Ligand binder design. Structure first.
Ligand SMILES: Nc1ncnc2c1ncn2[C@@H]1O[C@H](COP(=O)(O)OP(=O)(O)OP(=O)(O)O)[C@@H](O)[C@H]1O
Ligand SMILES: OC[C@H]1O[C@@H](O)[C@H](O)[C@@H](O)[C@@H]1O
Length: 247
């Protein structure tokens, strides 16, 4: 039979073998993979995130199966965009996890299949450390991809045939991938190296697409541009780099 613990065990193990029977099961009992019986009741977590949080060499073969089953229970978009709903991981989705676990293949698979690319990770865990969080990257898939130094993913997200992430997008703070980048900045060599490269990457991309929407001009909720934000918060490295490319 199939209940939450059995389903989670199977996916946690990456066993596609054991998923045999699931589709007929759900079909005959009128169940879906998004039904409450199949989520962690605290967080609302489905078995999709469960799968992603148990990779093995960044593989969990049950993922493409779970997706196909959701498709076939008429349920795929809802399934993929099912968000954590608890105060701590609120808003997080399968897409966020694919990005953070650094697996481009699942990002592509997820995006191609309809993943909301502007889903905001809003919960405590995603806010700044000083505000009781763990890692702040501006909440959005793109900003996450940028902040964790994954240019290939960043390019995938901004130019793909399915759904492009708008770079002008802002989080709850009105922060932008640029703002996010400075928040990420910590002045150390390798940090400044990538943060800088990335900043340039996005700035040039946003100029070449959308010829006339200057992204540095988008202010945050504190009405700070990314430049001033760096300034105000001691981000020497990134700040100098911004100025360098003036007149
Ligand atoms: N929401 C999350 N986002 C990112 N990482 C997580 C999250 N939840 C758990 N983790 C980490 O990733 C690992 C995988 O989580 P997974 O869902 O497989 O197990 P769990 O439900 O967290 O714990 P258990 O092993 O009791 O089920 C955990 O060991 C935890 O350290
Ligand atoms: O953390 C590894 C290294 O990274 C650099 O970006 C820092 O400036 C160094 O001080 C450090 O040894």
């Amino acid at each position: 039979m199939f209940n939450r613990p059995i389903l989670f065990d199977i996916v946690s193990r990456g066993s596609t073998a054991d998923l045999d029977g699931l589709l007929p099961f759900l079909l005959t009992h009128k169940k879906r993979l998004t039904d409450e019986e199949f989520r962690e009741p605290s967080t609302g977590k489905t078995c999709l995130p469960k799968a992603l949080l148990n990779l093995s060499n960044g593989r969990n073969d049950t993922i493409p199966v779970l997706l196909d089953i959701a498709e076939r229970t008429g349920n795929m978009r809802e399934f993929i965009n099912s968000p954590f709903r608890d105060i701590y991981y609120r808003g997080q989705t399968a897409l966020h996890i694919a990005i953070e676990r650094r697996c481009k293949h699942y990002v592509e698979l997820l995006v191609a299949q309809g993943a909301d690319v502007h889903a905001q990770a809003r919960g405590r865990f995603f806010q700044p450390k000083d505000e009781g969080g763990y890692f702040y990257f501006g909440e959005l898939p793109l900003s996450l991809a940028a902040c964790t130094n994954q240019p290939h993913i960043v390019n995938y997200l901004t130019e793909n045939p399915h759904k492009k992430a708008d770079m002008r997008r802002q989080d709850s703070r009105g922060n932008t991938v640029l703002h996010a980048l400075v928040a990420i900045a910590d002045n150390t060599r390798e940090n400044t190296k990538f943060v800088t490269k990335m900043y340039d990457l996005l700035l040039l991309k946003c100029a070449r697409l959308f010829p006339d929407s200057n992204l540095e001009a988008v202010l945050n909720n504190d009405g700070l541009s990314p430049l001033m934000m760096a300034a105000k918060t001691g981000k020497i490295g990134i700040f100098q780099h911004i100025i360098r490319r003036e007149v």
